[PDB]
Paper text:
[name]+ T cells recognize a broad range of peptide epitopes of [name] ([name]-[name]-2), which contribute to immune memory and limit COVID-19 disease. In summary, each peptide bound [name]-[name] canonically in the “forward” orientation that is described for [name]-DR,48 excluding CLIP. We observed little deviation in the overall structure of [name]-[name] irrespective of bound peptide, particularly within the peptide binding groove, where the solved diversity of bound peptides had little impact on the position of the [name]-[name] residues that lined each pocket.
Studies using peptides encompassing [name]–530 have identified the region to contain a potential [name]+ T cell epitope in cohorts of individuals recovered from COVID-19 (3%–22% of individuals responded). [name]–530 was designated a weak binder (IC50 = 2,624 nM). The structure of [name]-[name]-[name]–530 was solved to 1.4 Å resolution in space group P 65 2 2. At P9, P9-Thr is enriched in the BA motif but not EL data. The presence of Cys11 in the C-terminal PFR did not affect refold or crystallization ability, and additional density indicating thiol capping was not present as observed in [name]-[name]-S486–505. Within the core epitope, [name]–530 exhibits diverse physicochemical properties at TCR-facing positions: acidic P2-Glu, a short aliphatic P6-Ala, P7-Pro and P8-Ala stretch, and the basic P5-His, which shrouded over P3-Leu to form a central charge within the epitope core. [name]-[name]-[name]–530 presented a “best fit,” deviating only by Thr incorporation at P9. Despite this, [name]–530 was in fact a weak binding peptide in vitro.
Author numbering:
A (entry chain A): 1 to 182
B (entry chain C): 2 to 15
C (entry chain B): -1 to 190
């Protein structure tokens, strides 16, 4: 029975950050999210926007309700704050690595809350800032979150990489190492 | 094309 | 800003549409989560809201006093779940992407001692797949280990399925992949 499917509309609002999110998930993959700054629908695969539509203005009104409801719930709980749950991190590649053949490093950050995280790729100890892309926070059934960050790269046996993750639940930055061996 | 639809969030009780 | 350790407060709303046998059976679960605790839920098998924790009791009571909200939620299996299933079916439910299959040894070791042969199955969708190893046509199971199914985040999956071998000259190892994207199995051989 993989003859079952699940579609989830998942939203959040987080204070004091004033951060909202609105996304749809199908069987664990994001269909789309609403970019809260640009106020637009971002399809996870670009071609989905040729096959379907979505009206982001209604999603943004839901975020206004979610913010008001968070404020009510925060008071109703007597200002009980969230307990931080730190992430676990795995680095892998899109496909088996071959010397100088383009690939993608994937930093997968999982099982954390609240949904605020600072993720930096390091190559030979130094931050690699551009070329990277990242997903929004994806929901889990335990109401924690997961997230993917991607770095296209040319494999070399001399370079080493680290995905450096900072989160309130961690006592120090988590550095997940990756390198290509001969 | 067809449009995905959302469910709207109700206001919690004050 | 540096040194931001202010307490945080989180609210999540999740609407889950569960589909059984196409859209023959549909269940909606609407969940409210404060911090990491679900407080109230609407389950279409119940048809009204129910408190999950005491924090949610006021909302279950208030929402259950609203005829309009309840009628809208009771019809949502059709107006929302089945609707959205129909919108997305052709590119989600029906999405099929064929994997690329490669085989390689895990390290360079001499014949007649232990090695791990790797069958890499890359880039497929949906996640249901069968990856099996054969030695001279006979299936090997005891020495097989895998990464498990890896979701790449981009609507593809991958997996490595590995076989611990003591390869002898002349032996042929085959990795066979069955997957809904192909009508015949994919096979890749490695000759010792």
């Amino acid at each position: 029975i993989k003859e079952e499917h699940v579609i989830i509309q998942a939203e959040f609002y987080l204070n004091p950050d004033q951060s909202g999110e609105f996304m749809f998930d199908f069987d664990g993959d994001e269909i789309f999210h609403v970019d809260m700054a640009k106020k637009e629908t971002v399809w996870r695969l670009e071609e989905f926007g040729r096959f379907a539509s979505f009206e982001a203005q209604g999603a943004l009104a839901n975020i206004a309700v979610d913010k008001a409801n968070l404020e009510i719930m925060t008071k109703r709980s007597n200002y009980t704050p969230i307990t931080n749950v730190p992430p676990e991190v795995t680095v892998l590649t899109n496909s088996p690595v071959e010397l100088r053949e383009p690939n993608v490093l994937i930093c997968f950050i999982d099982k954390f809350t609240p949904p605020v995280v600072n993720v930096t790729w390091l190559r030979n100890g130094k931050p690699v800032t551009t070329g990277v892309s990242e997903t929004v926070f994806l929901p889990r059934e335990d109401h924690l979150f997961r997230k993917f960050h991607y770095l296209p790269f040319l494999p070399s046996t001399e370079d080493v990489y680290d995905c450096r993750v900072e989160h309130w639940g961690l006592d120090e930055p988590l550095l997940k190492h990756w390198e290509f061996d001969a | 094309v067809l449009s995905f639809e959302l469910l709207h969030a109700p206001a919690t009780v004050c | 800003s540096m040194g931001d350790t202010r307490p945080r407060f989180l609210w999540q709303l999740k609407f889950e549409c569960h589909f059984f046998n196409g859209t023959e059976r549909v269940r909606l679960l609407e969940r409210c989560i404060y911090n990491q605790e679900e407080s109230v839920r609407f389950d279409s098998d119940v048809g009204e809201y129910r408190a999950v924790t005491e924090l949610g009791r006021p909302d279950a009571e208030y929402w259950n006093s609203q005829k309009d909200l309840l009628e809208q939620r009771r019809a949502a299996v059709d107006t929302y779940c089945r609707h959205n299933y129909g919108v997305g079916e052709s590119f989600t439910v029906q999405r099929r992407v064929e994997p690329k299959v490669t085989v390689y040894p895990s390290k360079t070791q001499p014949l007649q001692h232990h090695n791990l042969l790797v069958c890499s199955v890359s880039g497929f969708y949906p996640g249901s797949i069968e990856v099996r190893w054969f030695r001279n046509g006979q299936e090997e199971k005891a020495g097989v280990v895998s990464t498990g199914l890896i979701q790449n985040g981009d609507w593809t999956f991958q997996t490595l399925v590995m076989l611990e071998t003591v390869p002898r000259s002349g032996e042929v190892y085959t990795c066979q992949v069955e997957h809904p994207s192909v009508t015949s199995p994919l096979t890749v051989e490695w000759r010792a």
